[PDB]
Design a protein around this ligand. Structure first.
Ligand SMILES: Cn1nc(Nc2nc(N[C@@H](COC(=O)NCCN)c3ccccc3)nc3[nH]ncc23)cc1C(C)(C)C
Ligand SMILES: Cn1nc(Nc2nc(N[C@@H](COC(=O)NCCN)c3ccccc3)nc3[nH]ncc23)cc1C(C)(C)C
Ligand SMILES: Cn1nc(Nc2nc(N[C@@H](COC(=O)NCCN)c3ccccc3)nc3[nH]ncc23)cc1C(C)(C)C
Ligand SMILES: Cn1nc(Nc2nc(N[C@@H](COC(=O)NCCN)c3ccccc3)nc3[nH]ncc23)cc1C(C)(C)C
Lengths: 303, 303, 303, 303
């Protein structure tokens, strides 16, 4: 397959995916009801844009991507012609197969942790593409989305594509019951899904686990993958101690195996943001990012 | 992770995996009770071999691989130091991430279809590594296992690693009830697992589906991946007609989209071996392999 | 080789090379007489910085890079231990082996053509790294130098590394006599060097030749590589017609094989800048860049 | 460029090159006066074969390869259409760009040293493709030529493509005056060409230098590339001592930096074959090949 066709390519969750696929070297086409600066930018980058929906817009497409949600003549034409029609969320999840993917999973804290990771990686000069709220970003980037080696993405356990993400590194911030309905209303089935998620890591991958959560601590011995734990717990690999405040800024000292203690600060209050920073610190440490870029990335994040 | 340690590296299912990891560039060590030509070959290829089991043999290992079978001192030492221990079957499934993987799934016909695929690819000069019965082979190869771009492997729905295979192409020969116990004794759960398996294909991947099976035909509209169907069914993409016998040899004409009809023969009787050949023909055609190599591989496979 | 050591890493021509090697994944160290924001940025990205020159700074280095120009104790230590010491210009030329290299050669017009190419590639979202005056740039980049797939570099026939560049695409704007002394004061030897330079392209490479120059036209039949010619000559593949001025802006229509005529403008006068733009248009066209990015890149270049 | 057309593809020096290009994924066509088993094998592997020479055989070709030397209508058609026509030897030299290239240079000993290297790499399971006498081989291979990661080739200083080889590792066995005519009949110009040859290595490359030759010893300080020296000289990095005979077999002890002494034997007499063996040992050691494979590769080479 070489040509991907987006139905509604100007949508806020669609244009970013099309831009990465252009960056990856694919032929990209898309239709929309109105030309916009979004479709003009995509066209400048090589996308073929159709205004209006008609069956012929899907001619030649190898796969269709359709908006979160079917009588549409492009879709109907693709089905009758046995062209696969994939939902937006699946194509988004698939982008991780082309990059060094960092999946930020857990029921709470994904958005902040993803942003903190992006901020530290940016401070180290790596310009990562990142996914928050289903939207691809690259902060102040001067390039097509997806240009960086790194893709940092929220992994939502309620998303149909959860068990199809192929990350190199995965965080589990915590395991709550918000999305029990996704798994038959059974919290134990939800827990097993996190184990299966972590087993999509390759044996050389890394699982970053918050052991302050008793549910994470419970599934920890089932993860037959390399693991680094973090939290305030005395037995966490990467720990925060001596937590203090100076204004709206929280300071703490981070302990890491075989490293000197490092003082960091973060511009947001609450232990949950200390934990989000610890997760970030584990990932940046494992990736080899300097202490200065870590301090700069955490300290400069607004919110 | 860089050093993989095999406990019982001389085993028939272990030595092949160790050889591929050596071919992939990893540090490989392994212990065994007896030195043999198998451990000498692994040592010639760069493995570090220990005879006898003692805890120190696992020093420095980043991951342990243990036989489909825990009091062992190397295992106990690895657990105490939080080194992941993965079963033989899981490391085997993981090899597909490094290669152009062809997963031959289905309840019946996996062994023959894999062998025919290997035989056709071999005839085209591609020397594939292939997995039948959990043993890695490359036929008459003059090289380390895994040297080819291609890895062709049986994908068994009863294997715990089934949903962790990451193939480029997947066959489903048929869906039977043999392994219902793996899925709570529920055939409908078993069917859903084949759908989830096919969704591990990337959007550019290929699903090769035998539509003569009513169960395969049922799940076909759920496969949101590129698909080629085969069988004797009049509506299959790739079909066999004019089936005849001349000795113990079965002849038939294969019809393929946008190709002229091609006469082939196979040295085994029964419509099930026609179907095994059709699956092979679909995969070889999609890979660009010549008619000559297809004819030669199929006719030259003994049994 | 894994550790590269720069003697005088803070210099304006050294820091850029060190940053790209960091981006490529190498261990990079460097010494300098004074810490500066340049060395602090390099340290943030993973460089090990030494202040002051002492023999031990070179310990562990696999290669040393020294500034354009031996009594230095780091150099002397490396020579005594048979570590290679490569000049800045050679390490710079070597960066092209890791990227899609575009070598802008010719006696005149290298700086402007390199800048125009970078500007058009930037407009297409490709954020190229480019080398003008021996200095690596990525204009308004949010990343380490070298992050882009593309490296656009002046290729100076007076540089000792000229015949060691390994580009994917090479321009020859013109062949003048400025640097005859490099070649024994013999213009015919200088012409032969341009032929040998173009033969460092791979057979899949591209030579972009300005046939308005009679010297380029002379060596053209000797280039056994894919070639696209440009200029005002009636027989050029890519030509400029209908040249006009409106202010300090020059307008013209570009003819390209199998394309519709395209109107462009450039914010600098003179036929030499029409030619610089034609070279840029040939490279952008062959790389697949849209007409809109070409028009925007050329029109937005100040000077 | 994607389609390469061979004029005389069945010739002994052409078919091997076409097979590697097929293995690399290119479209390959070729013409010849007679069908043979050689053209049938190429056709089985995906080559398009034309019988007879007519201009139309060159249609669609991006480059033509012609045997070791124009009235041919395919050549004339290509020249008239500005399709590059490259000689067999230049395309052969270019294959090294796709592989881990080992260039065996020096006036004497190239054929034996190449065969010994290939023999040792084969014993280590690497099935290398190698070039002796302008012919591509892979010994008893079950695969297309070029399938291995490694390409081992004689580098002849009289070959027009000498300074266009892009090896990762280069041997210089000795520098004699046989080919002074290639270099204006000036031995000093010949010496300088070997220096330029070694500078085509990248800074991470390796030069393997026989310092028993005083000419090699003379140019050694000009090689600003990683270097390992070998020979009987007391100051060589890798040395042979205790040379003895047992039958028609020559035994000696090889000393290597930071390794225990290793006894090896070879089936051919003369110090020149000790030197050919030392060169092989340097390359195999640097590539990480086990002592067992070295001993087996050297001991099993017939002659
Ligand atoms: C923006 N933001 N960022 C967060 N980040 C994390 N929050 C949690 N935990 C939550 C409590 O949630 C559980 O403990 N629920 C599972 C019980 N099995 C929490 C709340 C307060 C203090 C400490 C912990 N742990 C984490 N570890 N690493 C990262 C991380 C949390 C939030 C909001 C709740 C404000 C949305
Ligand atoms: C060695 N070998 N190779 C085989 N190959 C295939 N056998 C089947 N089918 C089985 C019947 O099994 C079902 O149909 N069961 C599922 C019902 N939902 C079958 C049996 C006889 C004739 C036709 C089909 N279909 C296929 N398609 N492509 C490949 C393939 C089969 C076997 C043995 C049974 C001898 C072990
Ligand atoms: C900034 N800038 N940019 C330039 N760009 C190019 N200038 C030339 N030619 C030079 C004349 O130089 C020769 O023709 N000398 C070789 C004779 N064998 C030229 C001068 C005036 C008008 C037209 C051509 N041709 C080219 N082709 N593509 C690009 C290109 C030139 C210059 C300066 C001279 C102002 C430094
Ligand atoms: C098959 N075969 N294999 C060979 N291998 C090597 N032969 C040489 N040397 C040649 C003498 O040649 C010079 O010394 N000429 C340069 C003077 N500046 C030589 C001859 C006899 C004993 C020792 C050295 N040195 C080497 N180093 N590594 C490899 C290597 C040589 C030969 C034949 C001559 C029989 C063709």
């Amino acid at each position: 397959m070489r040509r991907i066709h987006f139905v509604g390519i100007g949508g806020a969750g669609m244009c970013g995916i099309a831009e990465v696929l252009l960056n990856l070297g694919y032929e990209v086409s898309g239709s929309d009801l109105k030309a916009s600066a979004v479709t003009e930018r995509l066209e400048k980058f090589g996308a073929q844009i159709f205004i209006g929906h008609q069956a012929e817009n899907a001619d030649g497409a190898d796969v269709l991507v359709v908006s979160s949600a079917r009588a549409n003549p492009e879709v109907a034409s693709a089905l009758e012609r046995r062209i696969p029609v994939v939902p937006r969320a699946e194509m988004l999840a698939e982008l991780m197969r082309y990059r060094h993917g960092i999946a930020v999973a857990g029921t709470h804290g994904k958005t902040t942790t993803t942003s903190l990771i992006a901020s530290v990686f940016a401070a180290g000069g790596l310009d990562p593409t990142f996914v928050i709220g289903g939207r691809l970003n690259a902060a102040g980037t001067n390039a097509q989305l997806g240009a960086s080696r790194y893709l940092v993405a929220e992994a939502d356990e309620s998303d149909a594509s959860f068990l199809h993400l192929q990350p190199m590194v995965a965080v589990v911030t915590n395991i709550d019951a918000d999305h029990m309905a996704t798994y038959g209303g059974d919290f134990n089935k939800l827990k097993k899904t996190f184990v299966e998620f972590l087993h999509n890591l390759p044996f050389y991958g890394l699982a970053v686990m918050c052991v302050d959560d008793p549910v994470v601590r419970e599934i920890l011995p089932q993860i037959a993958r390399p693991t680094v734990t973090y939290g305030l717990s005395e037995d966490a690999d990467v720990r925060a101690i001596n937590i203090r405040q100076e204004g709206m800024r929280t300071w703490f000292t981070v302990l890491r195996p075989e490293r000197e203690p490092l003082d960091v600060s973060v511009n947001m209050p609450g232990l949950h943001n200390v934990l989000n920073s610890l997760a970030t610190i584990v990932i940046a440490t494992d990736e080899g990012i300097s202490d200065e870029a870590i301090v700069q990335g955490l300290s400069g994040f607004q919110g």
